[PDB]
């Protein structure tokens, strides 16, 4: 808008929010800071009219704190505290996921068109700083294939498994309910069979004629699920260590489907394990 | 007093906007309003602050505060000023229509006001007494930007207009205003003022 | 810090998981990223102290009533869901979901939740329901069912708007608290 102050007119800022404000909580508090509190709905793109119009407009949303580089830490098996501290602070890069339907939108396969125009941000100063907010110093976007987005989603899922295994590995007096959370959600891609979706969508030769040159990515999926499988194994083992009477039925379903997918990757996917 | 009244009621609006401005001041300073059937340990009193921006309503189940309004985040600091359909008064309040556990007795017939929003959510609230009930109805109707439904509001209107016109009549002492306004002496068609302008 | 079990069922024709994932992501309306795995969780405070919370995303297919009850035990709160615009959803919940839940879990604070609040007042949706002779069922009757169980609360919301959705979860968490 135009009615903004000089430093505010058609500007973009990122706010080091509180620990646990939900998006619209902080949003409303900001609205308290301001009159003419009309909120936009095309959250990603701007408005050229409002790039000149008066009657101040705003749009706010959460963004991703890009991981810092832990200096001299790039390989050490450092405990969690170091990680979690650098997951929050001394940050300057901030990406925002961008859903998009790119191509043909078949009903059963939402992964057919997921193309993420990942919008990142660079600001002047590193959070936290002498202001709980700063303007973006430079914006950038991306483009992410269903192959790619698949890749990152699954690998981050796997490392989340690893993290929960480790946090309940150092500590014993710790609720197994998160273990149920994960092991359940992963054990059945029930709503959509993710693994089967990847097989039909990319492992199929319709895709390796769709992406012959970009077949070197379905092999990425293969090696990544291959690295996933043993991680699933430690998940299963720790579950057995924390197995309870409600859990034995759950555990056996996990185990059965788990070696099922073990053979599925080894021979049905044909991948090689470790 | 014929042209006197013509002039007096004809110069209405300044007092009108003055009273409305005072009403907005009142809603902003606000107080702890009243809930429904807050008997078995319920905070019957709870502040309801209009923003100085006059757009958000800092209201919600605040404690049995004798001090009244406390400036902080109420339970729901927002009531959308724009979308309020109206406020129902008396029997039109569905909570007045309630005949169960939240049956409001006939002694709060004039204290019943339900502010309409979302078309399925209501604000079944109670005033401490009638005069401020009418005051807050006036305030929301000033948010509605319409006529005022407080007896006290017409009282203040008429009385302050009376004093204002009464102090107006000071320069015109020992004079009569012809009910037909005095004939405008003819302006010569030339505006070539012999003596200079300003 | 502490964790809370939270089971959630409801038919698969209403996409409650979209509600869950949009809430957890804190995403923009209509901008959630549908994952491939279920049983979501988060960690927010409603009051005083941060707490972990786990949403048992459960498929509503009736066959899985041999597996879902194994998830039931020691659940702090359950959330029963439907579509405000699907009379079949009402018939299922009043007839199957609610009774079986009350049977399997006769002792747990329960909150009913509506869905597609906008579509309840959507002129096109309601006119379709009339031309199909389905009922754009409104709040008071859901309230009546909530009284029938005496559920500690009932709320209704819309995914594309998240209206009261955050609140919905707020009473959901305070139900344990």
Curated annotation (Swiss-Prot), chain A:
<comment type="function">
    <text>Guanine nucleotide exchange factor (GEF) for Rho and Rac. GEF proteins activate small GTPases by exchanging bound GDP for free GTP. Along with DOCK1, mediates CRK/CRKL regulation of epithelial and endothelial cell spreading and migration on type IV collagen.</text>
</comment>
<comment type="subunit">
    <text>Interacts with CRK and CRKL. Interacts (via N-terminus) with tensin TNS3 (via N-terminus); the interaction increases DOCK5 guanine nucleotide exchange activity towards Rac. Interacts with ELMO1.</text>
</comment>
<comment type="similarity">
    <text>Belongs to the DOCK family.</text>
</comment>
<feature type="domain" description="DOCKER">
    <location>
        <begin position="1"/>
        <end position="274"/>
    </location>
</feature>
<protein>
    <recommendedName>
        <fullName>Dedicator of cytokinesis protein 5</fullName>
    </recommendedName>
</protein>
UniProtKB/Swiss-Prot annotation, chain B:
<feature type="domain" description="PH">
    <location>
        <begin position="26"/>
        <end position="147"/>
    </location>
</feature>
<protein>
    <recommendedName>
        <fullName>Engulfment and cell motility protein 1</fullName>
    </recommendedName>
</protein>
<feature type="modified residue" description="Phosphotyrosine; by HCK">
    <location>
        <position position="191"/>
    </location>
</feature>
<comment type="function">
    <text>Involved in cytoskeletal rearrangements required for phagocytosis of apoptotic cells and cell motility. Acts in association with DOCK1 and CRK. Was initially proposed to be required in complex with DOCK1 to activate Rac Rho small GTPases. May enhance the guanine nucleotide exchange factor (GEF) activity of DOCK1.</text>
</comment>
<comment type="subunit">
    <text>Interacts with ADGRB1. Interacts directly with the SH3-domain of DOCK1 via its SH3-binding site. Part of a complex with DOCK1 and RAC1. Part of a complex with DOCK1 and CRK isoform CRK-II. Interacts with PLEKHG6. Interacts with HCK (via SH3 domain). Interacts with ADGRB3. Interacts with DOCK5.</text>
</comment>
<feature type="short sequence motif" description="SH3-binding">
    <location>
        <begin position="178"/>
        <end position="185"/>
    </location>
</feature>
Swiss-Prot record, chain C:
<dbReference type="GO" id="GO:0021831">
    <property type="term" value="P:embryonic olfactory bulb interneuron precursor migration"/>
</dbReference>
<keyword id="KW-0963">Cytoplasm</keyword>
<dbReference type="GO" id="GO:0098794">
    <property type="term" value="C:postsynapse"/>
</dbReference>
<dbReference type="GO" id="GO:0008360">
    <property type="term" value="P:regulation of cell shape"/>
</dbReference>
<dbReference type="GO" id="GO:0030041">
    <property type="term" value="P:actin filament polymerization"/>
</dbReference>
<dbReference type="GO" id="GO:0008361">
    <property type="term" value="P:regulation of cell size"/>
</dbReference>
<keyword id="KW-0991">Intellectual disability</keyword>
<feature type="binding site">
    <location>
        <position position="14"/>
    </location>
    <ligand>
        <name>GTP</name>
    </ligand>
</feature>
<dbReference type="GO" id="GO:1900026">
    <property type="term" value="P:positive regulation of substrate adhesion-dependent cell spreading"/>
</dbReference>
<dbReference type="InterPro" id="IPR005225">
    <property type="entry name" value="Small_GTP-bd"/>
</dbReference>
<dbReference type="GO" id="GO:0070376">
    <property type="term" value="P:regulation of ERK5 cascade"/>
</dbReference>
<dbReference type="GO" id="GO:0003925">
    <property type="term" value="F:G protein activity"/>
</dbReference>
<comment type="function">
    <text>Plasma membrane-associated small GTPase which cycles between active GTP-bound and inactive GDP-bound states. In its active state, binds to a variety of effector proteins to regulate cellular responses such as secretory processes, phagocytosis of apoptotic cells, epithelial cell polarization, neurons adhesion, migration and differentiation, and growth-factor induced formation of membrane ruffles. Rac1 p21/rho GDI heterodimer is the active component of the cytosolic factor sigma 1, which is involved in stimulation of the NADPH oxidase activity in macrophages.</text>
</comment>
<dbReference type="GO" id="GO:0005634">
    <property type="term" value="C:nucleus"/>
</dbReference>
<dbReference type="GO" id="GO:0005802">
    <property type="term" value="C:trans-Golgi network"/>
</dbReference>
């Amino acid at each position: 808008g135009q009615g903004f102050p000089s430093f505010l007119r058609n500007k973009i800022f990122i706010y080091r929010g509180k620990e646990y404000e939900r998006r619209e909580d902080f949003s409303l508090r900001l609205l308290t800071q301001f009159p003419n509190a009309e909120k936009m709905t095309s959250t990603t793109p701007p408005g050229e009219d409002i790039k000149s119009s008066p009657k101040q407009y705003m749009q706010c949303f959460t963004v991703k704190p890009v991981m810092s580089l832990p200096p001299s830490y790039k390989d050490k098996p450092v405990p969690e505290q170091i990680l979690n501290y650098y997951r929050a602070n001394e940050v300057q890069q901030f990406r925002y996921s961008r859903p998009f339907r790119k191509g043909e939108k078949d009903p059963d396969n939402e992964f057919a068109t997921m193309w993420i125009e990942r919008t990142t941000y660079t600001t002047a100063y590193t959070f936290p700083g002498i202001l709980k907010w700063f303007e973006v110093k430079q914006i950038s976007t991306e483009e992410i294939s269903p192959l790619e987005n698949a890749i990152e989603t699954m690998e981050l899922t796997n490392e989340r498994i690893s993290n929960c295994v480790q946090q309940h590995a150092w500590d014993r007096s710790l609720s197994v309910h998160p273990l149920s959370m994960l092991l359940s959600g992963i054990v059945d891609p029930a709503v959509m069979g993710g693994f089967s979706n990847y097989e039909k969508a990319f492992f199929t030769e319709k895709y390796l004629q769709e992406h012959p040159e970009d077949q070197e990515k379905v092999e990425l999926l293969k090696r990544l699920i291959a690295l996933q499988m043993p991680l699933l194994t430690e998940g299963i083992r720790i579950h057995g260590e924390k197995l309870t009477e409600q859990l034995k039925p759950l555990h056996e379903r996990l185990s059965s489907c788990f070696r099922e997918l073990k053979e599925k990757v080894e021979k049905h996917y044909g991948v090689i394990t470790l | 007093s014929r042209p006197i009244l013509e002039l007096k009621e004809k110069i209405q609006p300044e007092i009108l906007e003055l009273i409305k401005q005072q009403r907005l001041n009142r809603l902003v300073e606000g107080t702890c309003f009243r809930k429904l059937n807050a008997r078995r340990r319920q905070d019957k009193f709870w502040y309801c602050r209009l923003s100085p921006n006059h757009k958000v309503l800092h209201y919600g189940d605040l404690e049995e505060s004798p001090q009244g309004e406390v400036p902080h985040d109420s339970l729901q600091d927002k009531l959308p000023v724009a979308d309020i359909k109206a406020v129902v008064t008396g029997k039109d309040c569905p909570h007045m229509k309630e005949k169960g556990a939240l049956k409001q007795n006939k002694e709060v017939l004039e204290l019943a006001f339900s502010i309409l929003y979302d078309s399925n959510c209501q604000l079944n609230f109670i005033a401490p007494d009638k005069h401020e009930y009418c005051i807050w109805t006036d305030g929301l109707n000033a948010l509605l930007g319409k006529d005022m439904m407080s007896d006290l509001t017409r009282n203040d209107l008429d009385t302050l207009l009376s004093m204002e016109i009464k102090l107006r009549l000071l320069d015109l002492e020992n004079i009569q205003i012809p009910d037909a306004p005095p004939p405008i002496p003819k302006e010569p068609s030339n505006y070539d003022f012999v003596y200079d302008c300003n | 810090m502490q964790a809370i079990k939270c089971v959630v069922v409801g038919d698969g024709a209403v996409a409650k998981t979209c509600l869950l994932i949009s809430y957890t992501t804190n995403a923009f309306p209509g901008e959630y990223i549908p994952t491939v795995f279920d049983n979501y969780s988060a960690n927010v405070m409603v009051d005083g102290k941060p707490v972990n919370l786990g949403l048992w995303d459960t498929a509503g297919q009736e066959d899985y009533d041999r597996l879902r009850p194994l998830s039931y035990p020691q659940t702090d709160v359950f959330l029963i869901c439907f579509s405000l615009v699907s009379p079949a959803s009402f018939e299922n919940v009043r007839a199957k979901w609610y009774p079986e839940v009350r049977h399997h879990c006769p002792n747990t604070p329960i909150i009913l939740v509506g869905t597609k609040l906008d579509l309840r007042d959507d002129k096109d949706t309601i006119e379709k329901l009339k031309e199909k002779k389905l009922t754009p069922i409104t709040y008071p009757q859901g309230l009546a069912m909530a009284k029938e169980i005496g559920a500690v609360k009932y709320l209704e919301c819309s995914a594309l708007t998240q209206r009261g959705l955050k609140t919905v979860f707020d009473e959901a968490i305070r139900a344990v608290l």
